[PDB]
Amino acid sequence: PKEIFLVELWKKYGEKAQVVRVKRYEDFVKLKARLSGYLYTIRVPPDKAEQLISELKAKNVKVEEV
Amino acid sequence: PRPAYRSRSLRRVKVKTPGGRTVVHYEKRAKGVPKCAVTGQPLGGMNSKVYRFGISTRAPSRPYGGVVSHKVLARAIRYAVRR
Amino acid sequence: KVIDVGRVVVKVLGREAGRKAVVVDIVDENYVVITGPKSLSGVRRRRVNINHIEPTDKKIEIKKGASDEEVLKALEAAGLVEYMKERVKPKLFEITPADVK
Amino acid sequence: MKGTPSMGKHNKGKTHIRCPRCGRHSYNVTKKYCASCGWGRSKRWRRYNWAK
Amino acid sequence: GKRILVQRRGRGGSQFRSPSWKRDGPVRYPPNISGRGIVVEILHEPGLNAPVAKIRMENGVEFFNYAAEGLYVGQVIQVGPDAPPAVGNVLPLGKIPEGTMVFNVEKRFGDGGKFARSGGTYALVIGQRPEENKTIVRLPSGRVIEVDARGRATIGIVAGGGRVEKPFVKAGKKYHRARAKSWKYPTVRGKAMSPYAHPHGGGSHQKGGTPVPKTAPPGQKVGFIGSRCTGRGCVRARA
Amino acid sequence: VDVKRLAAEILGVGVSRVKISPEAVGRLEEVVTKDDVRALIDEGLIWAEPEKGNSRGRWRELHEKKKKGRRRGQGSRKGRRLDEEEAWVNKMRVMRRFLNTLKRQGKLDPATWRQLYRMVKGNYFRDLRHLKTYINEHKLTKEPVK
Amino acid sequence: PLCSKWESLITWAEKGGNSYKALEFREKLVECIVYTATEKVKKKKLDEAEELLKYGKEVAKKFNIEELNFHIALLEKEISKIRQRRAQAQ
Amino acid sequence: MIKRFVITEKALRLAERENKITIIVERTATKKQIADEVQRLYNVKVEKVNTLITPRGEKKAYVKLAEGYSAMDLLTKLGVL
RNA sequence: CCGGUCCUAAGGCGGGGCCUAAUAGGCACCCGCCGAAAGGGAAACGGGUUAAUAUUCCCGUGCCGCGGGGGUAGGUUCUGCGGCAACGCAGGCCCCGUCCCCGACGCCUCGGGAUAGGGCGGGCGGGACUGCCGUCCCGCUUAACCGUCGAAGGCCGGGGAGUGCCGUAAUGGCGAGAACCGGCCGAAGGCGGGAAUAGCCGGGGGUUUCCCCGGUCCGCCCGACUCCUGGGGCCCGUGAAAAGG
RNA sequence: CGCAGGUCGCAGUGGCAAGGGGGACCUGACUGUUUAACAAAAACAUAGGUCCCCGCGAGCCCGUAAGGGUGUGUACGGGGGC
Ligand SMILES: [Mg+2]
Ligand SMILES: [Mg+2]
Ligand SMILES: [Mg+2]
Ligand SMILES: [Mg+2]
Ligand SMILES: [Mg+2]
Ligand SMILES: [Mg+2]
Ligand SMILES: [Mg+2]
Ligand SMILES: [Mg+2]
Ligand SMILES: [Mg+2]
Ligand SMILES: [Mg+2]
Ligand SMILES: [Mg+2]
Ligand SMILES: [Mg+2]
Ligand SMILES: [Mg+2]
Ligand SMILES: [Mg+2]
Ligand SMILES: [Mg+2]
Ligand SMILES: [Mg+2]
Ligand SMILES: [Mg+2]
Ligand SMILES: [Mg+2]
Ligand SMILES: [Mg+2]
Ligand SMILES: [Mg+2]
Ligand SMILES: [Mg+2]
Ligand SMILES: [Mg+2]
Ligand SMILES: [Mg+2]
Ligand SMILES: [Zn+2]
């Protein structure tokens, strides 16, 4: 598993994921892009997570809550 | 594999698991780093810890790279320029 | 002085070690500007520590702060162009720890 | 010590194993031949006339 | 049974052999060295009697020589007839001036060096007889011999001298030395055995033996073996 | 089957701490699987007795007394407790870092520093307080060291 | 500074037109600051952490890295909580 | 190459819970040959083969069928259950 | 992905040859091979499951070797770029050769850094006891793997020092280049990701092991015989080799 | 780690754990080794001393032989006695 801090970098893997897992906390949200090779995690502010989640759904990437 | 763990060839590493057990992991020791062909000292840029063979190590950007130290190369070039 | 404008040198350290160049400018007691033309020898134009170049007995006549084509025309005047393409080869098997203590 | 205590050391080692040619527990693993039929040192079968 | 210790040694059992795998290689001249070389290493070799120099020739040939005293790592040495008689140089014996101390002396050219190889020893070049290609040398024992003038020697004395002047203070110290050598350690006196195990073994008051002739057979040829004389009188007659 | 062997694996405790209620003696003969044991554990008919931890109440009371100076007299010592070699290491580091700081701040001249440095190494000073008194008594600094 | 090797590589990669590498070096710069500062806070080396956070705030301004600001705010919040507990205990 | 099926309590549990059939084969059969034989005889797809040699000298294979074929259905079809 | 399997050690066997009345007897020579389940050496960890296997089954998260597809950097006579330098950075592709290095190494001793483990005070939950006191006990965990950071040590640039000056646990260091300033390479391990969704503890409801709820915390200390690092000393003793990289 | 004070017992390293000491002679210098199953020693070994055979195609030893050990060695060395 790998951690990415930049949203722009993470989206390259997020757009190609088999599934994106969402784990919510009070101050941040973990988004985990499950690719065939690696699980890519990014921590984002909750407002950013909603925007990112909407874009992934619009690109027909599966999003699940864990 | 049990007498193989009685020898000190492998590191005995004690680790606690997420299940609450403390186990011993038997791990390999580091390989020696590349050394200068003249002085035998470790070469700069290549003395990182490596635990298995088959891993490509990048040599410094210099003629003769990870073969001799910069000190040996500079002196040998000074000799050749004159000679 | 040996390391002067026009003195041909061979860099001994760095990525460009072993390549011939020419001193074109003097900055201070530690640094001179060498540009053994990049298209000719592979040394780009920048300052260099005088401890990282070995002087050669060959010297050319050029002006202070000379440019790359002025250096190029002077090397062919002295007929050293093919000299400035050969890279010095060390003989590592003749070095012993006594020399590099 | 030569009796019962020393017998304790015959618990783990071996001189002979089973021979692939004759099947007896007679193949000397160090010498690499069979003490009964000679396999490994003799292509002919070992058998002496002093043996019945 | 009854074969005595000297007879069992010849069978070459493990306890009588030299553990020569502990060493890097034989210390001998290669047959075709010439030119200049560099001393690249000076090493301790287990079981040897002197430090060993590793020499690299210009053509990349490496060989082991016993290190001359004063030889240093990085020194340039010269091999051949043109070589000056300086310490560490390897010269044909017919070219070495008289009165010169030399070591690792070949008896015939190409044998690799035979005489004056132990630490602190040397041979003296006494004379030259070039009409038959012979050099006269004095060996460490004092014996004067003739050698092939084309054979090679090294200039100087063997390094590591004075080793035997310091006592082996303990039995354990000699024990560790013996393990790098071929010696059987330790030794039992003949008169400490029973008669079946030695000619000296036996009686209620055990005694040594009188000398045996040179024709004595193995198993009888122990003690003094065809000795010219014994004791202090023999040393006096030797002088 | 031995129900205690199975129960210990399920409860994750030693067999020595598995208790089987005597009211379930009728049901012990019917146990076949570990799931059967899990039924009995759920019904409370099999449980684990809490482990014993040695109580430290007596030790904690004694530990406070020893901090006040009690029970460490001549008659209670059987061997060496003070590491003399470690004491030297502490003594050198305490003194040297004090003297080296004074020199780095310019309060001590290097000639005076060297004399005190060698005197510290020579076991002249008993402790840092003794070193300070010597410095103050002999006016080795412009201002007294606290 | 601790993460100056990454600052130079970003300039070097950008000056060469390597947009992909400049992004990767940008990621490594944030990793260097956040990972090191987080470890210092976890070990309660608050002074070492604060110097990293100060430098982190400057390079975030220099390179316009929004995610660096978000993670610095999180770590500063944890630092104040640690300091709050210390002062109360004192 | 197949000698018989194993229909023990353990084998039947692995059929229902892990989609595996258990067979006894010739001791010299390899995992490659076992997978080929099962596919040819029964027209299923084999995911993987685990093998062992029993203390009585017989080779046993736990053959996991791919995710479109039922181990329980195959045993019923063969009439070995 | 745990061992064998591979490699060579001390040594051994076979063919050829030489010896032998002869062999199934001997072996200095040539060729090959064998020789370690404690040496060298590719790659897996945690949780769950069974009557009985568990790094092997199942779940999750990975790694190695070999091969292929796409993208990218790069290339397409000719060369990658930066830095005074130590050295840094995606550093094109295929074949062949040579060299070097790693593999690869004792004992004694003493400084430094960690981790396993242990403890103290507070908190939350649960347990023990009853004559008096209210104390005592248990849980509060975090694998491999990815990233980043890196102590000692070494090195680079500046500097240019004898009224010396800088030190250590100890030995001490310096125009054969000190102090001091800036930098480069660089452990165990830390931390984030893994990962709380697991496990544990407590409270409930089912049924046959499934579901729900709450906690999984704060601040300190000791600390190895385990792991890492460096300094010093000893030897008439010097502490393997090869595969592989 | 120390100081001052109070105090109990027959007994305070209270159990556990834990040298009796000194003088002299003979003898082997010492540590070490030994009769597995009646001998542990003053016996063997030992460092040190000394003598002998030997310049290497040697000396001494093994093998029927081919050949071998010492020797990957060389008198500050190999072997053999006391
Ligand atoms: Mg092994
Ligand atoms: Mg090892
Ligand atoms: Mg017997
Ligand atoms: Mg045997
Ligand atoms: Mg021996
Ligand atoms: Mg006797
Ligand atoms: Mg007799
Ligand atoms: Mg007689
Ligand atoms: Mg007699
Ligand atoms: Mg007490
Ligand atoms: Mg002391
Ligand atoms: Mg198997
Ligand atoms: Mg093999
Ligand atoms: Mg079991
Ligand atoms: Mg507590
Ligand atoms: Mg000390
Ligand atoms: Mg007692
Ligand atoms: Mg005695
Ligand atoms: Mg007896
Ligand atoms: Mg007895
Ligand atoms: Mg005696
Ligand atoms: Mg005497
Ligand atoms: Mg006599
Ligand atoms: Zn047989």
- Chains H and F are in contact, defined as 3 or more C-beta pairs closer than 8 angstroms: no
Q: Of H6, H22, H19, H35, which is closest to residue H72 (Cα–Cα)?
A: H19
The alpha-helical segments, DSSP class H, found in B1-83 are 3-6, 70-82
Q: Of H75, H9, H76, which is closest to residue H38 (Cα–Cα)?
A: H75
Interchain proximity B77–C15, CB inside 8 Å: no
Kind of pairing between the strands at A19-24 and A63-65: parallel
> CA(B19)–C1'(I199) in Å?
5
- Chains G and H are in contact, defined as 3 or more C-beta pairs closer than 8 angstroms: no
The answer to whether some atom of strand I lies closer than 7 Å to the beta carbon of B63 is no
CA-based radius of gyration for chain B: 20
Tokens of F54: 């040695």
**Which protein residues have their CB within 5 A of the ion that is ligand 2?**
B 9
Distance from the CA of F88 to the center of ligand 16, in angstroms?
7
Q: Is E75 helix (H, G, I), strand (E, B) or coil?
A: coil
> What resolution, expressed in A, was reported for this entry?
2.0
**F37, F3 Cβ separation under 8 angstroms:** yes
What element of type H or E holds F135?
helix F128-137
Q: Give the number of residues written for chain C.
A: 101
Scored b (16 or more CB within 10 A) or e, H51-62 reads eeeeeeeebebb
In whole angstroms, what is the distance from residue F20 CA to residue F22 CA? 6
In whole angstroms, what is the distance from residue E24 CA to residue E63 CA? 11
- Chains A and G are in contact, defined as 3 or more C-beta pairs closer than 8 angstroms: yes
The amino acid that residue G65 corresponds to is: I
**What is the signed CA dihedral for F88, F94, F96, F98, rounded to 10 degrees?**
-160
Q: Would you give the DSSP letter of residue E192?
A: G
The distance of Cα F66 from the centroid of its chain, to the nearest Å, equals 15
* Residues sharing a CB contact under 8 Å with residue E214, sequence separation 6 or more, in sequence order: E225, E226
Contacts of G21 in chain A (CB under 8 A): none
Give D6-28 as a DSSP string: HHGGGGS--SEE--TTT-SS-EE
> What are the C-alpha distances in Å from C43 to residues C10, C21, C24?
10, 7, 13
User: What are the backbone angles phi and psi of residue A5, rounded to the nearest 5°?
Assistant: -100, -30
In whole angstroms, what is the distance from residue E147 CA to residue G23 CA? 79
The residue written with tokens 């030297």 in the block is F88
According to DSSP, the residues that pair with E152 across neighbouring strands are E92
In whole angstroms, what is the distance from residue B57 CA to residue B74 CA? 23
Question: E strands within B1-83?
Answer: 11-16, 22-27
In whole angstroms, what is the distance from residue B46 CA to residue B69 CA? 11
**E151, E108 Cβ separation under 8 angstroms:** yes
Q: Is B25 helix (H, G, I), strand (E, B) or coil?
A: strand
**What is the signed CA dihedral for F27, F33, F39, F41, rounded to 10 degrees?**
90
Interchain proximity G23–A6, CB inside 8 Å: yes
Sheet architecture: strand order including H46-53: H2-5, H20-25, H59-65, H46-53
Distance from the CA of E3 to the center of ligand 7, in angstroms?
10
The residue written with tokens 């040819």 in the block is H40
In whole angstroms, what is the distance from residue E148 CA to residue E114 CA? 12
Q: Is B12 helix (H, G, I), strand (E, B) or coil?
A: strand
Please report the sign of the dihedral spanned by the C-alpha atoms of residue F2, residue F7, residue F10, residue F16.
negative
Chains that touch H (3 or more CB pairs under 8 A): none
Lookup: nucleotide whose C1' is closest to E225 CA: J53
CA-based radius of gyration for chain C: 14
Q: Of G21, G70, G55, G27, which is closest to residue A3 (Cα–Cα)?
A: G27
Chain breaks in chain A (C to N over 2.5 A) after: none
- Write the burial class of residue B46 (CB in 10 Å: 0-12 exposed, 13-18 middle, 19+ buried): middle
Q: Is H21 helix (H, G, I), strand (E, B) or coil?
A: strand
- G31, G74, G77 ranked by CB distance to A5: nearest: G31
Q: Does C51 touch chain B (CB under 8 A)?
A: no
What element of type H or E holds H36?
helix H31-42
Interchain proximity E73–C93, CB inside 8 Å: no
User: What are the backbone angles phi and psi of residue E121, rounded to the nearest 5°?
Assistant: -90, 165
According to DSSP, the residues that pair with H59 across neighbouring strands are H25, H53
- Write the burial class of residue H79 (CB in 10 Å: 0-12 exposed, 13-18 middle, 19+ buried): exposed
Measured between its terminal Cα atoms, the distance across chain D in Å is 37
Give chain G as a DSSP string: -TTHHHHHHHHHHHHTT-HHHHHHHHHHHHHHHHHHHHHHHHTT-HHHHHHHHHHHHHHHHHHT-HHHHHHHHHHHHHHHHHHHHHHHH-
Cis peptide before E186 (omega within 30 of 0): yes
Please report the sign of the dihedral spanned by the C-alpha atoms of residue A9, residue A11, residue A16, residue A18.
positive
Q: How many helices (H) and strands (E) does chain C have?
A: 1, 5
Contacts of A27 in chain G (CB under 8 A): 74, 77
User: What are the backbone angles phi and psi of residue A60, rounded to the nearest 5°?
Assistant: 60, 40
The residue written with tokens 């000298």 in the block is H57
The residue written with tokens 């987080």 in the block is G38
For strand I, the positions having any atom within 7 A of a protein Cβ are 2-3, 9-14, 24-25, 37-43, 45-52, 55-58, 61-65, 72-74, 79-91, 99-105, 110-112, 115-117, 119-121, 126-127, 135-150, 153-159, 163-170, 183-201, 205-210, 218-220, 224, 226-229, 235-240, 244-245
The answer to whether some atom of strand I lies closer than 7 Å to the beta carbon of F122 is no
The residue written with tokens 């635990």 in the block is B51
* Residues sharing a CB contact under 8 Å with residue B32, sequence separation 6 or more, in sequence order: none
CA-based radius of gyration for chain H: 11
Measured between its terminal Cα atoms, the distance across chain A in Å is 16
Distance from the CA of E186 to the center of ligand 21, in angstroms?
14
Kind of pairing between the strands at F18-20 and A63-65: unpaired
What element of type H or E holds A32?
strand A29-34
Residues at the binding site of D for Zn(2+) are 19, 22, 34, 37
Scored b (16 or more CB within 10 A) or e, B49-71 reads eeeeeeeeeeeeebbbebbbbbb
Nearest ligand (C-alpha, residue F5): 14
The residue written with tokens 């000619």 in the block is E199
In whole angstroms, what is the distance from residue C43 CA to residue B76 CA? 20
Please report the sign of the dihedral spanned by the C-alpha atoms of residue H5, residue H8, residue H14, residue H19.
positive
**B39, C98 Cβ separation under 8 angstroms:** no
Tokens of H37: 């034989």
Interchain proximity C100–B78, CB inside 8 Å: no
Interchain proximity E40–C94, CB inside 8 Å: no
Q: Which residue is nearest to nucleotide I241 (CA to C1')?
A: E21
Q: Would you give the DSSP letter of residue H57?
A: S
Tokens of E222: 């122990």
What element of type H or E holds H65?
strand H59-65
In whole angstroms, what is the distance from residue A24 CA to residue B24 CA? 35
Q: Give the number of residues written for chain A.
A: 66
Distance from the CA of E163 to the center of ligand 23, in angstroms?
30
- B39, B61, B62 ranked by CB distance to C100: nearest: B39
> CA(F67)–C1'(J18) in Å?
29
**What is the signed CA dihedral for F72, F78, F83, F84, rounded to 10 degrees?**
100
Elucidation technique: cryo-EM
User: What are the backbone angles phi and psi of residue E135, rounded to the nearest 5°?
Assistant: -115, 140
Contacts of A5 in chain G (CB under 8 A): 27, 30-31, 34, 67-68, 71
User: What are the backbone angles phi and psi of residue A20, rounded to the nearest 5°?
Assistant: -110, 125
Kind of pairing between the strands at C7-11 and C20-26: antiparallel
G9-13 own/partner pairs: CB under 8 Å, 24+ apart: G10/G63
Q: Is E144 helix (H, G, I), strand (E, B) or coil?
A: strand
Lookup: nucleotide whose C1' is closest to F53 CA: I137
In whole angstroms, what is the distance from residue E230 CA to residue E85 CA? 43
The residue written with tokens 């760095």 in the block is C14
In whole angstroms, what is the distance from residue G71 CA to residue A45 CA? 9
> What are the C-alpha distances in Å from E104 to residues A54, E29, E91?
89, 9, 11
Chains that touch F (3 or more CB pairs under 8 A): none
Q: Of C37, C20, C44, C43, which is closest to residue C72 (Cα–Cα)?
A: C37
The residue written with tokens 């070495």 in the block is E96
Q: How many CB atoms lie within 10 A of CB E209?
A: 14
The amino acid that residue A54 corresponds to is: S
> CA(E198)–C1'(J82) in Å?
14
Measured between its terminal Cα atoms, the distance across chain G in Å is 33
Q: How many CB atoms lie within 10 A of CB E95?
A: 18
**F92, F118 Cβ separation under 8 angstroms:** no
In whole angstroms, what is the distance from residue E76 CA to residue C98 CA? 12
Tokens of B23: 């186990």
Q: Would you give the DSSP letter of residue D48?
A: -
In whole angstroms, what is the distance from residue E113 CA to residue E26 CA? 11
- Write the burial class of residue C101 (CB in 10 Å: 0-12 exposed, 13-18 middle, 19+ buried): exposed
Sheet architecture: strand order including A63-65: A2-3, A39-44, A29-34, A19-24, A63-65
The nearest alpha carbon in chain C to E76 belongs to C94
